């Protein structure tokens, strides 16, 4: 009574959509290393034997797209035709043009940096929950950690039959406490991972339970009733882009809160800070985490929105789920007194010209590695 | 006091991401017209002069991709190099292969149709709100209708300077009533639309207020304080794929609830019913709308989740926001007694082999045209 199930998923570095996010952000980083003011909107498409870059870049950088793309694919682990994809021998196609001059003139040309317009309209949410130290939903944290564990055991040669493409999914039973949520138990785990032609299904299922799940999920959450769907398709030899076409910005819920909170639809990867889809979403996470770590609420949702060419947000909204003694109006006044959510100020506060974006493009953008948006602001009120 | 702002956006038929959704669904429909059991996973990429199809189709259909793609672009209105894109003369590139045999064997081969596995893992939400007759958030309904009005005035020659690429955004001030939400006023409207080189900015801004906003938004929601950002970039001559690379499944919040409810991350367009990203999301909307229209709640969120190769959902969750006298446990029992959320049963209930998908791929998948998932089920309990 008063309990509910909630499910989140994550994917591995070799999931074809995630390959595209990582390549898009490798391209962004390569530009920012030479030109901190590069305007980048780099979409990636992946299918059998092909990486295509499509989009708009205006930059002073001299970037070797062949090297940047192939080094990203090498890092992921696609290094042989036996695995379905090889950085050494794949096709890299480029359909990149300058940023539209109409966008440039409306957003940033002859603008003071602090007063640059939003690079697009849109809406963005931030979310934080006190249910974990990293202020993230346990469902998504566990799902990410299961993919990270697969990559670790592949890379260290423990499970050498593993290939880079994986997906995981975690269902947790929760109770509610005055709008806060408390995780009780893991109800169901799914793991699907690409594998070689030698290993049999029983060996894989045993290894996924004993060397992956048991190495990630605390035993206090697992019981005799927990349901395991391990290699539920029965065979996953074909994988990566050969199994499924990938695109940049097709894992936006994996990238954020795993179904919790809300999403405004904007993808992160391949975009410089003037694209508020990324900078304002990072800032909204920073606000949400600052409110929870500051002790003002246990759980909070922040919405912001923008118009192309306009610096200041068009709307700011705060929902505390009943977990603050302060009114949502009082929290909004604290946020307005402590934060400046113009993209040309967010860039300074969160250091968003730094080429750290490829690091964000797997295992979620939030809840790890003390990125600037994960370091709470000390609030004055 | 007790009021809040909430923002949603929509895009027009010529927005490059939406072009891709419509082409992906034109391809799906072309297959289903000949082979109701076609397995389709068709991604589309659009950039200057290029439509690329990438993905996996196993089908008995004989499909002319050149004709299907070009007819979709013609319908959208890109018919001349002056508009930045022309169905007659663009490049159509195809990178389509058979569905992975590993997926096919794990999902549907030698399966009874009712007992087909989910085509992937994932999570999906349904949402419904009594704030409009169509059980959708007013923010998203108004945003969609503003884009539909632009297309209408372009196509009827009223505003012949209009081009197909548009975006809109609506901020509404709401009050809450025991978990239900009541829209009070329109706080801010954004409209950006591609235009010709002849029309001046003041003519466009006047027309967008008088012939678009006033023709869509009831005057009772507008006042002297309503903020209008009309052509806020100042110039939008370059547009469509020339202005911004488009991809299938990059408008998933426009396609659904405009930030309300929740999203599990799955894109709809280009996918047959075995892909639960589409079929289970449609079924979850159907459940949510059935609960609200059945008088069991004013507002409701439904989560379901799946594992690849497994027919039945792994989890089902119901949140009524405090708007039911029934417990969320009692609502879950009503749902379990009235619905079968296996994809091989959803296909029968919602007629998902019918080639109606291109019609879903602009102006939202929900809240219009009495699609099967918009016709409430009469509930027995
Ligand atoms: C988005 O995201 C989410 C939302 C909401 C939630 C919740 N909250 O918050 C509270 C307080 C309580 C509850 C809930 C739920 C949900 C469900 O399903 C979906 C069921 C039941 C329940 O209960 C969560 C999550
Ligand atoms: C997702 O989606 C959403 C969620 C939630 C909501 C709400 N609910 O429900 C209630 C009852 C009340 C409230 C809310 C809000 C929000 C905000 O922002 C975001 C602010 C404030 C407020 O309040 C909505 C929407
Ligand atoms: C079902 S295709 C969608 C995603 O599922 C994964 N996938 C691909 N092939 C299989 C398979 N044979 N079994 C399980 N998951 C798969 C890959 O991560 C792919 O991007
Ligand atoms: C800002 S690029 C993202 C989207 O905004 C729109 N857009 C493109 N160019 C402009 C412009 N000059 N002004 C306003 N919106 C634009 C198009 O719909 C594009 O897909
Ligand atoms: Cl790299
Ligand atoms: Cl923790
Ligand atoms: Cl400030
Ligand atoms: Cl058509
Ligand atoms: Cl209505
Ligand atoms: Cl039933």
Curated annotation (Swiss-Prot), chains A, B:
Gene Ontology biological process terms in this record: cellular response to leukemia inhibitory factor; cellular response to methionine; one-carbon metabolic process; positive regulation of TORC1 signaling; protein heterooligomerization; protein hexamerization; S-adenosylmethionine biosynthetic process
Family: Belongs to the AdoMet synthase family.
One cellular-component annotation, GO: cytosol
Species whose genome carries this gene: Homo sapiens
Catalysed reaction equations from the record: L-methionine + ATP + H2O = S-adenosyl-L-methionine + phosphate + diphosphate
Cofactor field: Mg(2+); K(+)
Binding site for Mg(2+): 17
Tissue specificity: Detected in kidney.
Ranges for region Flexible loop: 99-111
Keywords, sorted A to Z: Acetylation, ATP-binding, Isopeptide bond, Magnesium, Metal-binding, Nucleotide-binding, One-carbon metabolism, Phosphoprotein, Potassium, Transferase, Ubl conjugation
EC class of the enzyme, as a word: transferase
Gene name of the record: MAT2A
Protein name: S-adenosylmethionine synthase isoform type-2
């Amino acid at each position: 009574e008063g309990t509910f199930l909630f499910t989140s998923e994550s994917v591995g570095e070799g999931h074809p959509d995630k390959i595209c996010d990582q390549i898009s952000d490798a391209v962004l980083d390569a530009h920012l290393q030479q030109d901190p003011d590069a305007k980048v909107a780099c979409e990636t498409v992946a299918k059998t034997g092909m990486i295509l870059l499509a989009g708009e870049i205006t930059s002073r950088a001299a970037v070797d797209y062949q090297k940047v793309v192939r080094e990203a694919v090498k890092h992921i682990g696609y290094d042989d035709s036996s695995k379905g994809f090889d950085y050494k021998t794949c096709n890299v196609l480029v359909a990149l043009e300058q940023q539209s001059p109409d966008i440039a003139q409306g957003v940033h040309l002859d603008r003071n940096e602090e007063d640059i317009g939003a690079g697009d309209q849109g809406l963005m949410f931030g979310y934080a929950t006190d249910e974990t130290e990293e202020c993230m939903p346990l469902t998504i944290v566990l799902a990410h950690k299961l993919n990270a564990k697969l990559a670790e055991l592949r890379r260290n040669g423990t499970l050498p039959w593993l290939r880079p493409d994986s997906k995981t999914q975690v269902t947790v039973q929760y109770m509610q406490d005055r709008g806060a949520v408390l995780p009780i138990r893991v109800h169901t785990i799914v793991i699907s991972v690409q594998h070689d032609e030698e290993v049999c299904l029983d060996e894989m299922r045993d290894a996924l339970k004993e060397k992956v799940i048991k190495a990630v999920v605390p035993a206090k959450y697992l019981d005799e009733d927990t349901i395991y769907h391990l290699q539920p398709s029965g065979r996953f030899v074909i994988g990566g882009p050969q199994g499924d076409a990938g695109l940049t910005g097709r894992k936006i819920i994996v990238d954020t809160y795993g179904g919790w909170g809300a999403h405004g639809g904007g993808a992160f990867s391949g975009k410089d800070y003037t694209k508020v889809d990324r900078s304002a979403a990072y800032a909204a996470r920073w606000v949400a985490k600052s409110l929870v770590k500051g002790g003002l609420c246990r759980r909070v949702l922040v919405q912001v929105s923008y118009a192309i060419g306009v610096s200041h947000p068009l709307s700011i909204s705060i929902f505390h789920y009943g977990t603050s003694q302060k009114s949502e109006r009082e929290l909004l006044e604290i946020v307005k007194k402590n934060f400046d959510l113009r993209p040309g100020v967010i860039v300074r506060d969160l250091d968003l010209k730094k080429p750290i974006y490829q690091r964000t493009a797997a295992y979620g953008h939030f809840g790890r590695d003390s990125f600037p948006w994960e370091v709470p602001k000390k609030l004055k009120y």
